[PDB]
Amino acid sequence: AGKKVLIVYAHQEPKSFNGSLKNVAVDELSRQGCTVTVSDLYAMNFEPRATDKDITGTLSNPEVFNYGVETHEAYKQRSLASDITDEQKKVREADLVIFQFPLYWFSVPAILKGWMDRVLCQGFAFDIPGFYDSGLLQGKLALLSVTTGGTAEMYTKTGVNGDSRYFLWPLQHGTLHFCGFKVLAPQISFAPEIASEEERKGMVAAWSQRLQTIWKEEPIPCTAHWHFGQ
Amino acid sequence: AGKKVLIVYAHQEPKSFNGSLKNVAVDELSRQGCTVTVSDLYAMNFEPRATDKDITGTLSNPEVFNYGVETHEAYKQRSLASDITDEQKKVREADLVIFQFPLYWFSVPAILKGWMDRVLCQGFAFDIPGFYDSGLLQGKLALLSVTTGGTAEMYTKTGVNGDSRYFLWPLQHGTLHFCGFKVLAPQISFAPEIASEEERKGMVAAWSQRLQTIWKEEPIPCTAHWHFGQ
Numbered sequence: 001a002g003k004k005v006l007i008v009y010a011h012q013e014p015k016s017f018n019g020s021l022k023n024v025a026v027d028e029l030s031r032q033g034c035t036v037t038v039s040d041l042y043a044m045n046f047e048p049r050a051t052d053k054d055i056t057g058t059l060s061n062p063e064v065f066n067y068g069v070e071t072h073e074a075y076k077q078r079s080l081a082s083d084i085t086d087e088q089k090k091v092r093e094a095d096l097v098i099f100q101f102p103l104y105w106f107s108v109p110a111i112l113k114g115w116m117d118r119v120l121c122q123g124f125a126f127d128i129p130g131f132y133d134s135g136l137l138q139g140k141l142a143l144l145s146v147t148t149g150g151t152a153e154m155y156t157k158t159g160v161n162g163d164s165r166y167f168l169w170p171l172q173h174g175t176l177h178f179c180g181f182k183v184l185a186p187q188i189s190f191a192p193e194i195a196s197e198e199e200r201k202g203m204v205a206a207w208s209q210r211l212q213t214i215w216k217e218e219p220i221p222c223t224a225h226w227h228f229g230q
Numbered sequence: 231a232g233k234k235v236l237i238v239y240a241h242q243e244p245k246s247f248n249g250s251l252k253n254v255a256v257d258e259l260s261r262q263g264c265t266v267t268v269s270d271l272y273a274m275n276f277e278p279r280a281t282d283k284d285i286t287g288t289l290s291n292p293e294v295f296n297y298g299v300e301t302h303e304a305y306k307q308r309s310l311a312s313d314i315t316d317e318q319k320k321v322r323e324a325d326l327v328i329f330q331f332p333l334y335w336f337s338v339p340a341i342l343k344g345w346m347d348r349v350l351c352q353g354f355a356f357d358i359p360g361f362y363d364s365g366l367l368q369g370k371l372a373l374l375s376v377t378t379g380g381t382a383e384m385y386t387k388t389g390v391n392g393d394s395r396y397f398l399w400p401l402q403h404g405t406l407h408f409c410g411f412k413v414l415a416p417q418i419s420f421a422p423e424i425a426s427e428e429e430r431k432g433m434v435a436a437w438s439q440r441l442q443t444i445w446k447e448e449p450i451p452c453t454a455h456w457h458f459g460q
């Protein structure tokens with residue numbers, strides 16, 4: 001409906017399976033009348049390193065540099081690098097944030113890890129206190145749309161990779177829940193490089209079709225039990 | 231003696247607590263007669279992004295860029311960027327790789343994420359297929375030395391952060407095990423910033439003491455059961 005979506009997208013190749021998933025999301029959400037923004041990290045050459053270049057003002061302690069202290073202070077003073085504050089404005093206005101990425105080492109590619117490290121700073125995304133259900137991005141929805149090398153069978157409790165939910169923990173809970181997001185169920189598109197033409201088409205359309213009803217979903221309970229069972 | 235250690239270190243500040251932990255590791259291993267090499271990622275301005283610049287000369291398929299494929303072929307045809315192959319030589323020669331970093335979003339800082347993404351390429355670290363135990367770095371030891379913001383109590387199974395072992399899974403299992411490493415128990419230095427001066431000394435001194443008999447240690451069983459089970 002009347003909602004803003006930010007898609008944070010992390011793939012080098014527009015003709016990729018990730019690129020297709022990002023474009024069907026843009027096409028489907030735009031069809032519904034949503035306001036849609038994409039941060040295409042590699043095309044923006046997004047800086048992933050957390051450095052002292054991310055602060056442009058007088059440092060709180062120029063003798064011993066502490067990235068988290070300095071960026072928290074910079075956020076309050078408005079002295080963060082503008083690439084960071086550009087992304088913060090997108091996130092502040094968004095009702096839903098979708099992350100579209102290939103799994104790299106059971107996690108996000110580094111360029112996207114750098115977006116989380118630098119954009120989700122203290123004062124903007126959380127405060128101490130003001131995290132988990134009290135995070136500063138409360139009200140907002142987030143969803144991981146992930147592609148894998150490994151097959152769905154590999155990513156089971158007794159498969160070699162363990163259950164797919166296990167590698168979701170640091171991203172869903174440690175990052176998105178910590179910032180206050182409600183987490184929608186992940187979209188995992190398994191092993192598209194191995195899959196047939198028709199399985200690949202089906203995976204694209206399953207995503208497109210789920211997006212038709214995304215505003216009707218409830219978030220997951222983003223708890224240890226959900227991720228690990230027991 | 232004779233062992234080679236590589237320390238891959240990811241902190242911006244030489245006077246940091248991470249910096250102190252890296253420096254006692256160098257002091258202690260050097261005292262024992264070990265060959266020691268440090269990759270100081272921030273001081274190297276190490277590139278974290280996985281891009282086509284990682285291949286020199288010409289591409290295996292310059293119409294559709296697939297990073298895994300292109301870097302696999304580059305590795306085989308000795309055509310990877312020299313920042314990558316410089317790291318790979320350090321890893322190839324090392325008996326033990328220590329990673330020293332502050333926890334960022336239940337994981338490694340993006341600069342060290344990019345080291346894993348770009349250094350541990352197919353053909354070097356693992357083959358498809360050719361992993362976990364068919365994994366090309368077998369024989370090597372790896373150890374995560376992590377500092378946290380949250381206290382040990384926060385990091386228990388019913389604490390807000392969940393168990394420490396839960397965030398360890400993508401690094402120890404999805405990355406280090408997958409590559410063939412035997413994984414030594416993690417060194418976790420919980421919450422240095424909230425001091426005291428004496429307890430901080432204590433944590434530096436336990437790390438130094440542990441490194442005294444590091445070569446006597448048995449690896450962990452790097453299993454779903456160790457990370458999640460009872």
Ligand SMILES: Cc1cc2nc3c(=O)[nH]c(=O)nc-3n(C[C@H](O)[C@H](O)[C@H](O)COP(=O)(O)OP(=O)(O)OC[C@H]3O[C@@H](n4cnc5c(N)ncnc54)[C@H](O)[C@@H]3O)c2cc1C
Binds near residue numbers: 101149200346
């Ligand atoms: C550094 C690194 C670390 C990795 N770590 C892991 C890991 O820990 N665990 C794991 O499982 N995997 C891992 N992988 C594998 C990685 O997750 C997969 O290679 C990636 O998820 C595949 O997605 P893709 O977009 O690149 O696929 P592509 O190679 O782009 O897609 C496969 C095929 O789909 C085709 N296609 C594109 N669009 C469409 C469409 N509209 N309809 C039909 N077909 C289409 C493409 O043309 C291509 O033929 C790793 C890879 C790298 C490089």
Ligand SMILES: Cc1cc2nc3c(=O)[nH]c(=O)nc-3n(C[C@H](O)[C@H](O)[C@H](O)COP(=O)(O)OP(=O)(O)OC[C@H]3O[C@@H](n4cnc5c(N)ncnc54)[C@H](O)[C@@H]3O)c2cc1C
Binds near residue numbers: 050423
């Ligand atoms: C982007 C980001 C994401 C984060 N995500 C998480 C997360 O997911 N989970 C989490 O728990 N935390 C997280 N943190 C917090 C982070 O892990 C801690 O801030 C960090 O681990 C502190 O380690 P440090 O080396 O920077 O401590 P420092 O601030 O460098 O130092 C601690 C104290 O020890 C002093 N010191 C240095 N050397 C010695 C010495 N030899 N003896 C005694 N004292 C010494 C220092 O001067 C300082 O006073 C995050 C931080 C950031 C910026």
Ligand SMILES: COc1cccc2c(C)cc(=O)[nH]c12
Binds near residue numbers: 150151298405
């Ligand atoms: C290309 O596929 C891959 C590349 C790198 C790592 C993995 C892991 C850790 C599991 C998996 O199933 N596939 C992988």
Ligand SMILES: COc1cccc2c(C)cc(=O)[nH]c12
Binds near residue numbers: 128379380
């Ligand atoms: C400054 O401390 C922190 C910064 C950013 C994230 C965390 C998380 C996820 C848990 C925690 O205990 N502390 C954190």
Ligand SMILES: [Zn+2]
Binds near residue numbers: 172173174178223
């Ligand atoms: Zn959660």
Ligand SMILES: [Zn+2]
Binds near residue numbers: 451453
């Ligand atoms: Zn394992």
